[PDB]
Design a binder for this molecule. Sequence first.
Ligand SMILES: OC[C@H]1O[C@@H](O[C@H]2[C@H](O)[C@@H](O)[C@H](O[C@H]3[C@H](O)[C@@H](O)[C@H](O[C@H]4[C@H](O)[C@@H](O)[C@H](O[C@H]5[C@H](O)[C@@H](O)[C@H](O)O[C@@H]5CO)O[C@@H]4CO)O[C@@H]3CO)O[C@@H]2CO)[C@H](O)[C@@H](O)[C@@H]1O
Length: 305
Amino acid sequence: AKVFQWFGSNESGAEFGSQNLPGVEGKDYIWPDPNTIDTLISKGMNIFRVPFMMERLVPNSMTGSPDPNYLADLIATVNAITQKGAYAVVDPHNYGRYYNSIISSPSDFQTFWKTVASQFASNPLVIFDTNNAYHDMDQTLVLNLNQAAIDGIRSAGATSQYIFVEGNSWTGAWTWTNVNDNMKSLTDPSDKIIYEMHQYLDSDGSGTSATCVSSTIGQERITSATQWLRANGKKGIIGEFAGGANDVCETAITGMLDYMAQNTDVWTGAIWWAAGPWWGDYIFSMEPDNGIAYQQILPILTPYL
Ligand SMILES: OC[C@H]1O[C@@H](O[C@H]2[C@H](O)[C@@H](O)[C@H](O[C@H]3[C@H](O)[C@@H](O)[C@H](O[C@H]4[C@H](O)[C@@H](O)[C@H](O[C@H]5[C@H](O)[C@@H](O)[C@H](O)O[C@@H]5CO)O[C@@H]4CO)O[C@@H]3CO)O[C@@H]2CO)[C@H](O)[C@@H](O)[C@@H]1O
């Protein structure tokens, strides 16, 4: 059932092997497979988030020219998604950092975002994601970086697209109200800001263990974020979530999605972490046809597709 505006999967791989910059395609990183994206589209997903490294797209200086090969493959991936009618989220998977240093220049970040947005300005099914999971950095800077991204995107004439903004504390939903209240002041002339939060279900919320705290931990961890969105007249998306292929996690996943389904005045949907071609036996692999989550979790996501 078409419960949410957006329901889909991350398509990870282009950000793999980040210790090697620029690194080598086919050895350090790989782009998503359009054929397996088609399969997930056939299952009813309509949004695919595509991580990539800023340093690989725009080397040495974020204000510089794109790397032709890496950009060409980003373009190809985005077009493979949007040509089918689905939404493609362009996600610089960079944690608010560039060459492992916090991005402290909003002006530099705005130029980076004009450069990226210019490549996709006429495509209304592209979604721009300012940066993945800002963390351990100045709270006002996170606000200013998100605004600079919005400004750069709209300055390129990319005005039809939604913009996913992300907050501090790894943009966690469960930590949102404790640190990210200032994010309410972001402005967009297109009025298409979506607050992208992430929520994992293991004890520390890192999403590194297949064990979930309890059968209700997901719905508990997004309640205050839901109220924050409603109180501030904002819209949100869960841009990453996952749980292990086990009984407790299946119930936590459905409980949290069932809760968002009764709160769609603020929740636009949810995006699983993650599919992609190099996950192998990853505990959360949504990659068709043999990913653990593709085999064992996707059946419980049927009511939302
Ligand atoms: O296919 C054959 C091919 O293999 C090449 O070598 C591969 C190797 O086979 C892969 O196992 C390896 O894969 C690892 C990636 O290098 C690494 O980047 C990736 O890191 C993951 C991490 O495991 C995961 O926890 C993390 O999730 C977080 C999100 O990123 C955050 O946004 C969110 O906040 O929290 C979640 C949960 O913590 O994601 C990152 C990626 O973003 O882990 C992979 C598995 O270990 O890659 C090698 C290449 O780099 C070989 O070189 C080729 O020759 C060969 O053909």
